[PDB]
Write a protein that binds this ligand. Structure first.
Ligand SMILES: OC[C@H]1O[C@@H](O[C@@H]2[C@H](O)[C@@H](O)[C@H](O)O[C@@H]2CO)[C@H](O)[C@@H](O)[C@H]1O
Ligand SMILES: [Ca+2]
Length: 386
């Protein structure tokens, strides 16, 4: 049924990743996943058979309040990162450790210092960032996890760990990079930014990183077709960075809607009025979208190393009509994007919009944990659909 046009020029070792950070909180909430045959199966095995070769996991320093109540969003700390890493490694997939260097969501608007670093002068915070990265990585190595890449920050367009001055941000980038370098010289160091469609943005950031001697290997970008411009532009801005600074480039996050329906009762991020939707909101449209960004990154040439799909399995803990019972699960296991307990850390955003999954309709599995046909885009990009 599904159609996937072969990606021309796709390298054989192209990174095909997925970020399934919410998996632990979901399994604790009772969510189960299946394979093609329809029998319960570890999602990591299913991802592996679908052609995925990399797993990305977000890591928050201390995503809990004083009493130990999870902030939600998967309650992703180092402990869960290790659980995920071991399963990724056990299923022959490399790991991408994504340090937010914050106790909660880090993005263009939010780059809050971890609670533990709130009262530290810059120098001590830098030491703390370095130390944290160093210890976290060692713990993962001790667990036998195969770490292929580390992200020093997440969508750090305007800040990092409470800092907004680029001179200080670069020192933090370097502090983190340091720890990676000291851990394993083979691990790729990536910096992650977003809004590639902004005129001159990526060019300015790359040049600034250069002027501040920031030591990194991959210039990563998020790419959500809804707001981030054309694929042509994406290729253009990433190619300029690659050519100009000799860096590898990749898409650290991307996704698309396979349905307009909200499966758990918590309003979804997409689709919405105003957003750009070049592909139909169907399983086929979702597949075209993924295949296209893979093509766009591949078009960069030798520098385009891969694409990570963001949260392809953040499915509902229950039906939309069971909203109130769902909240119980979200609140208890943090299997939603945020819990009310996060209000102390982020009162402005999480504080009033906390709840369930905002991306259940952009998963590569249906609302019941069955893999959608679009899951096989990872395989068909190499050959195309017969
Ligand atoms: O109720 C939905 C909720 O989503 C938030 O987005 C969070 C997070 O803050 C982002 O950084 C991340 O990219 O996506 C998750 C949800 O998938 C958003 O910030 C809130 O305003 C709400 O839209
Ligand atoms: Ca939802």
């Amino acid at each position: 049924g599904l159609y996937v046009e072969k990606v021309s020029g796709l390298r054989k070792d192209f990174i095909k990743g997925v970020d399934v950070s919410s998996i632990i909180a979901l399994e604790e909430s009772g969510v189960a996943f299946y394979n093609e045959s329809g029998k319960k199966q570890d999602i990591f095995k299913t991802l592996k058979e679908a052609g995925v070769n990399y797993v990305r996991v977000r890591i928050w320093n201390d995503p809990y309040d004083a009493n130990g109540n999870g902030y939600g969003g998967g309650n992703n700390d180092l402990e869960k990162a290790i659980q995920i890493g071991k399963r990724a490694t056990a299923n022959g997939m490399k790991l991408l450790a994504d340090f937010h260097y914050s106790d909660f969501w880090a993005d263009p608007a939010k780059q809050k210092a971890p609670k533990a670093w709130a009262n530290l002068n810059f120098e001590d915070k830098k030491t703390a960032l370095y130390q944290y990265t160093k210890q976290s990585l060692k713990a993962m190595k001790a667990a036998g996890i195969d770490i292929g890449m580390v992200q020093v920050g997440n969508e750090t367009n305007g800040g990092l760990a409470g800092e907004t001055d680029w001179a200080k941000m670069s020192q933090l980038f370097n502090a983190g990079s340091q720890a990676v370098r000291e851990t394993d010289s083979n691990i790729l160091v990536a910096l992650h930014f977003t809004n590639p469609e902004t005129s001159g943005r990526y060019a300015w950031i790359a040049e600034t990183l250069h002027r501040h001697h920031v030591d990194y290997d991959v210039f990563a970008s998020s790419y959500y077709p809804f707001w981030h411009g054309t694929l042509k532009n994406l290729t253009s801005v990433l190619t300029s960075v690659a050519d100009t600074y000799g860096k590898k480039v990749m898409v650290a996050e991307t996704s698309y809607t396979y349905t307009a329906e909200d499966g758990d009762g918590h309003g979804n991020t997409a689709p919405k009025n105003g957003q750009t939707l070049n592909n139909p909101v169907t399983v086929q449209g979702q597949a075209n979208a993924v295949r296209d960004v893979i093509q766009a990154v591949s078009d960069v040439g030798e520098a385009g190393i891969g694409v990570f799909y963001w949260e392809p399995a953040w499915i509902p803990v229950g039906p939309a009509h069971r909203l109130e019972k769902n909240k119980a699960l979200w609140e208890t296991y943090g299997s939603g994007w945020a819990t009310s307990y996060a209000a102390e850390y982020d009162p402005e955003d999480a504080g009033k919009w906390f709840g369930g999954s905002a991306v259940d309709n952009q998963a590569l599995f249906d609302f019941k944990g069955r893999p959608l046909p679009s899951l096989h885009v990872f395989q068909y990009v190499d050959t195309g659909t017969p």
